[PDB]
């Protein structure tokens, strides 16, 4: 549906403001989402200090711009952003702003899969040789995917996830997130290797090389 | 033990000959192994065209230099190299020549662990969020390590591995290697993130940055 998706853009906690070809890293996905007709609003989660970076483009973008205060951990920032979404939003699209080069086609794909399944995340096959290791440092002998963002979830599903975690006192890590505790399926939408997270100066050189084709 | 280890250096199949600060990538680990008193010999697996690259330093290095012809797949190249090792070698040290920056201290560690356990491999905790995905593209809900080289194995163990694979007609992939079929334990020696494999031009820039501290 048109104007059905609310983006929560994680830009709080800086790496995501270091420019890439003269535009702060955070603005790349911001603009990518803003041009998509499916996207109704972008809730930016950032320190108030950096609000003007997004605010300047508010009149030029075809989305509603909203803000939310960052929390202690990533999941707290998501919860904060969630409190700001349109009451009739059909899909929440959570995105790490340190991921500038997400392609429109791949956002479309994960939105569509999220709509279909209830929860979906962009992923790529893990290129490295990865093995399970037990507590004695031995290989556990017996397909693996690297997760990216967007992570797309229906709001009612996300709300119930937060409810279950707080009422039971469950532990949330980056690996064991809200969805890991739910019995609802999570689809992995096949993305592109170009959707790297930019943290080290080595990544900026790679990101420049990708934007230059 | 001194002069107990035989290195099989995989340089066949080029990325491993592109210079890093003016020295061909393959020579970095070659020299690293050559200076270690534990190392008796290096069996280089490469196309005869590139033999002179290593041969030039033969009189300057404190190891025996030997050569072997590369095979179809990685495991065939290992088998070829294995046929060349000293009959009294106590440890086989298999190394991807596309890994120039392996530290001496980490080679020492994996040699020691290989000697103790029978098989050991350098590994680092996987930094990415990695998940198991089933055939329907759904996350399988429930520690993961990225494997590097050296991969260190007692020769009698490796020989038996090759025997089991050929006599049964087992399938060998990079993930499901010789050791995966054996009941003998494989230890993961904790390495350094700097032990990257150099294949893309982006890696060369990172490798230069690492050698420059
Ligand atoms: O880890 C996730 C994955 Cl793999 C897929 C989806 Cl759809 C959502 C999450 C997630 N991440 C965070 Br932080 C929260 Br809150 C949630 Br829900
Ligand atoms: O994959 C491995 C690991 Cl994880 C540990 C060790 Cl010690 C050896 C191997 C290996 N790799 C290849 Br190719 C051969 Br042949 C063997 Br044996
Ligand atoms: K829009
Ligand atoms: K509105
Ligand atoms: K971005
Ligand atoms: K992408
Ligand atoms: K469908
Ligand atoms: K990206
Ligand atoms: K990185
Ligand atoms: K030596
Ligand atoms: K000898
Ligand atoms: K090397
Ligand atoms: K190392
Ligand atoms: K020991
Ligand atoms: K390396
Ligand atoms: K690479």
Swiss-Prot record, chains A, B:
- Broad class of where this protein is predominantly found: plastid
Q: Which cofactor does it need?
A: Mg(2+); Ni(2+); Mn(2+)
Query: Any phenotype upon disruption?
Result: Albino phenotype and seedling lethal when homozygous. The phenotype is caused by an early arrest in chloroplast differentiation.
Q: In which tissues is it expressed?
A: Expressed in leaves, stems and flowers, but not in roots.
Enzyme Commission (EC) number: 2.7.7.60
The record's subcellular location field reads: Plastid, Chloroplast stroma
Q: In which pathway does it act?
A: Isoprenoid biosynthesis; isopentenyl diphosphate biosynthesis via DXP pathway; isopentenyl diphosphate from 1-deoxy-D-xylulose 5-phosphate: step 2/6
Give the record's GO biological process terms: isopentenyl diphosphate biosynthetic process, methylerythritol 4-phosphate pathway
**Which keywords are on file for this protein?**
Acetylation, Chloroplast, Isoprene biosynthesis, Nucleotidyltransferase, Plastid, Transferase, Transit peptide
Q: What class of enzyme is it?
A: transferase
- Which catalysed reactions does the entry list for this protein? 2-C-methyl-D-erythritol 4-phosphate + CTP + H(+) = 4-CDP-2-C-methyl-D-erythritol + diphosphate
What inducers act on this gene? Answer: Circadian-regulated with a peak in the late period of the light phase.
Positions marked as site (Transition state stabilizer): 15
Record bears the keyword Plastid: yes
Any one Gene Ontology molecular-function term assigned to this protein's record? 2-C-methyl-D-erythritol 4-phosphate cytidylyltransferase activity
Gene Ontology cellular-component annotations: chloroplast; chloroplast stroma
User: In the record's cofactor note, how is the cofactor described as bound?
Assistant: Divalent metal cations. Mg(2+), Ni(2+) and Mn(2+) are the most effective. Co(2+) and Ca(2+) are only minimally effective.
What residues does the record give for site: Positions MEP for the nucleophilic attack? 197
UniProt KW Nucleotidyltransferase keyword: yes
Summarizing the function annotation, the protein's role is: Enzyme of the plastid non-mevalonate pathway for isoprenoid biosynthesis that catalyzes the formation of 4-diphosphocytidyl-2-C-methyl-D-erythritol from CTP and 2-C-methyl-D-erythritol 4-phosphate (MEP). Is essential for chloroplast development and required for pigments and gibberellins biosynthesis.
- Similarity section: Belongs to the IspD/TarI cytidylyltransferase family. IspD subfamily.
Q: What is the name of this protein?
A: 2-C-methyl-D-erythritol 4-phosphate cytidylyltransferase, chloroplastic
Per the UniProt record, the source organism is Arabidopsis thaliana (Mouse-ear cress)
**Taxonomically, what lineage is the organism?**
Eukaryota, Viridiplantae, Streptophyta, Embryophyta, Tracheophyta
Gene (UniProt): ISPD
**Full protein stretch here:** 76 to 300 of 302
């Amino acid at each position: 549906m048109e104007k059905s998706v609310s983006v929560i853009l994680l830009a709080g906690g800086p790496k995501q403001y270091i420019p890439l070809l003269g535009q702060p890293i955070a603005l790349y996905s911001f603009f990518t989402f803003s041009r998509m007709p499916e996207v109704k609003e972008i809730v930016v989660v950032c320190d108030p200090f950096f609000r003007d970076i997004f605010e300047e483009y508010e009149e030029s973008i075809d989305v509603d711009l909203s803000f939310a205060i960052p929390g202690k951990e990533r999941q707290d920032s998501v919860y904060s952003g969630l409190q700001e979404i349109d009451v009739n939003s059909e899909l929440v699209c959570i995105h790490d702003s340190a991921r500038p080069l997400v392609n429109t086609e791949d956002v479309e794909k994960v939105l569509k899969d999220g709509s279909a399944v209830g929860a979906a995340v962009l992923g790529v096959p893990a290129k490295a040789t990865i093995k399970e290791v037990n507590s004695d440092s031995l290989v556990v002998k017996t397909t693996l995917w690297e997760m990216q963002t967007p992570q797309v979830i229906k709001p009612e599903l996300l709300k119930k996830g937060f409810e279950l975690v707080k009422s039971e006192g469950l532990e949330v890590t980056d690996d064991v997130s809200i969805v890991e505790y739910l019995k609802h399926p999570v689809y992995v939408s096949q993305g592109s290797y170009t959707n790297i997270k930019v943290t080290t100066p080595d990544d900026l050189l790679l990101a420049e090389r990708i934007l230059s084709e």
